[PDB]
């Protein structure tokens, strides 16, 4: 062979990004988080996206004997087991088989979170049980509307930089695409005096103490530091430390120059 079978195009629903909570216990929330962390579409989500995604997941109760999903239906939902036992069943040519079972944990349907996907199996409660569900369009809006919010404009953080004020819009979006995030605990050393001038930083939340010898600069939400890495490769003059819990954006200058060329050539412009 079926080396000659074409590969069909795929397509999720349109959503242009230009609020209900389903209550659940503390332990349900941890276990539900647990069962999701290795699944591709959840693996890399920032903590707040995740939290929004758990918030959205709804309670589905089942009675012993109930079909949770039916083979060839239910193409838009993903499910995690909170509670109960379940049989898994596949019908073929042919023949209807029990191909396995679930014992109070398990998930299924994650592909439906990408585009419509007719379920490959029927799944039946063999006890009374409960699951958590998640609609695709709900999932998509959370994620997309959240990345749109991080990206235009935290493009807004970037454009406020004196060294970068002369970027074009599209050049700025290239930096938005790849700019990394870093989190530091109280008194962590973000930058050490003497080190490689590898990258510059923007404070997203919290506060950073710039020191030398003692105090030079205080950094807080919207301010940059380490930015001389953009114009000279000579070693770090100062040292940055996190005051309390700190979140920074962080940009490798060498990645910056692959995308855009030397920062000074941008500063030269008229």
């Amino acid at each position: 062979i079926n080396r000659f079978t074409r590969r069909a195009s795929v397509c999720a629903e349109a959503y242009n990004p230009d609020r209900i909570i389903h209550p659940k216990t503390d332990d349900q929330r941890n276990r539900l988080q647990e069962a999701c962390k290795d699944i591709l579409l959840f693996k890399n989500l920032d903590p707040e996206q995740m939290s929004q995604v758990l918030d959205a997941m709804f309670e589905k109760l089942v009675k012993e004997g109930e079909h949770v999903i039916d083979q060839g239906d239910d193409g838009d939902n993903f499910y995690v087991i909170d509670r109960g036992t379940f049989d898994i069943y596949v019908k073929c040519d042919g023949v209807g088989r029990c191909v396995g079972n679930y014992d109070n944990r398990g998930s299924f349907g994650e592909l439906a979170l990408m585009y419509n996907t007719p379920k490959a199996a029927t799944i039946t409660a063999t006890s009374p049980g409960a699951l958590w569900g998640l609609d695709r369009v709900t999932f998509r809006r959370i994620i997309v509307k959240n990345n749109a919010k991080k990206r235009k404009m935290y493009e807004s953080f970037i454009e406020s930089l004196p060294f970068l004020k002369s970027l074009e819009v599209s050049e700025r979006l290239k930096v938005v695409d790849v700019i990394g995030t870093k989190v530091y605990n109280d008194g962590e050393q973000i930058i050490a005096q003497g080190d490689l001038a590898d990258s510059f930083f923007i404070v997203e939340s919290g506060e950073v103490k710039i020191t030398m010898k003692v105090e030079i600069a205080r950094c807080f939400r919207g301010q940059y530091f380490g930015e001389l890495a953009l114009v000279t490769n000579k070693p770090r003059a100062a040292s940055a430390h996190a005051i309390g819990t700190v979140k920074c954006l962080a940009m490798d200058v060498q990645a910056f120059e692959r995308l855009l060329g030397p920062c000074m050539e941008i500063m030269k412009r008229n």
Partner: protein
């Protein structure tokens, strides 16, 4: 001369873009002949022009299905974009119209069949063979992108071979004009770039990714990311770990690690020198980029053409009727078409 060529090209485009074309024919003007391909979103039909005898490939979309699948905008994108673009390697649109039940787009008929058929029948293409095609894609993407158009469904099934053995790109259903970033998860599972899979937002870098997948699959005969389950394919794509066949030349492998780069600060196409990183790359050292544009190179392969309406080079499909209801459906939704 390239920098100015695009300037004239952007000029011509913007003129047709803003002041578009409409209702340029009607169904009773053609004879249906055979179904040439069907798919997830629409079917294409060989047709003969009743008055001039001319043959055409006519795309037929069903207004009700488009509305259910939440893809109205994609249909309007395709027709608008097709009416305004112009390039040696894009299949030209000749007529468009709608009726009570369907939208119709009548393209040039490219009789040589899908690259998919040919590549699967042969197994793989020699690197020069593959290089010849890859070049046309590199040039076609340069053109589209300078108009801020992304294509979004590169794959052997969407590339047709003409009688001169050159390529025509055909299915524009996913093409969009994007100035900033766009967000629709769409394409073909094997050809999806990481940032589409993870909904990061994206623009032109995904076409170049796709080209890496395409080039790889032409020279190896199978795409670089494969598995039993789609999710596992996506897990591989997001990983970005690629194994190369032992017969890949070292020059080829180098181009492909640069194209199949998950990291946007390193993907060829997305850096300072943009597309020149690819065009100047050594695997393409033997390519005469103007000669390819001018169609002055011998194709490594010419299809067998037996006669004006011949369908030898296409698979056979269950023939459905083109049904037109006496009631007009979804009029408001498609007024712009």
């Amino acid at each position: 001369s390239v920098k100015e060529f695009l300037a004239k090209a952007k000029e011509d485009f913007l003129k047709k873009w803003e002041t578009p074309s409409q209702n340029t024919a009607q169904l009773d003007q053609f004879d249906r002949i055979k179904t040439l391909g069907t798919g997830s979103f629409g079917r294409v039909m060989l047709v003969k022009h009743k008055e001039s005898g001319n043959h055409y490939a006519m795309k037929i979309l069903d207004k009700q299905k488009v509305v259910k699948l939440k893809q109205i905008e994609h249909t309007l994108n395709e027709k608008r974009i097709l009416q305004a673009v112009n390039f040696p390697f894009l299949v030209k649109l000749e007529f468009s119209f709608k009726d009570n039940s369907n939208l119709y787009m009548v393209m040039e008929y490219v009789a040589g069949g899908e690259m998919f058929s040919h590549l699967r029948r042969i197994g793989r293409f020699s690197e020069p063979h593959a290089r010849f095609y890859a070049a046309q894609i590199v040039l076609t993407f340069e053109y589209l992108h300078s108009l801020d158009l992304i294509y979004r469904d590169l794959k052997p099934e969407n590339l047709l071979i003409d009688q001169q053995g050159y390529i025509q790109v055909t299915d524009f259903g996913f093409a969009k004009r994007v100035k900033g970033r766009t967000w629709t998860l769409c394409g073909t599972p094997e050809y999806l770039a990481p940032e589409i899979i993870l909904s990061k937002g994206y623009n032109k870098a995904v076409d170049w990714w796709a080209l890496g997948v395409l080039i790889y699959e032409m020279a190896a005969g199978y795409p670089p990311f494969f598995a039993d389950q789609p999710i596992q394919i996506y897990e591989k794509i997001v990983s970005g770990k690629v194994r190369f066949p032992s017969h890949f030349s070292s020059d080829l492998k180098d181009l492909l690690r640069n194209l199949l780069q998950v990291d946007l600060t390193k993907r060829f196409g997305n850096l300072k020198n943009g597309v020149n990183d690819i065009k100047n790359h050594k695997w393409f050292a033997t390519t005469d980029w103007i000669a390819i544009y001018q169609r002055k190179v011998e194709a490594p392969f010419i299809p067998k053409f037996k006669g004006p309406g011949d369908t030898s080079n296409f698979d056979d499909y269950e023939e459905e009727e083109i049904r037109v209801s006496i009631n007009e459906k979804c009029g408001k939704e498609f007024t712009e078409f």
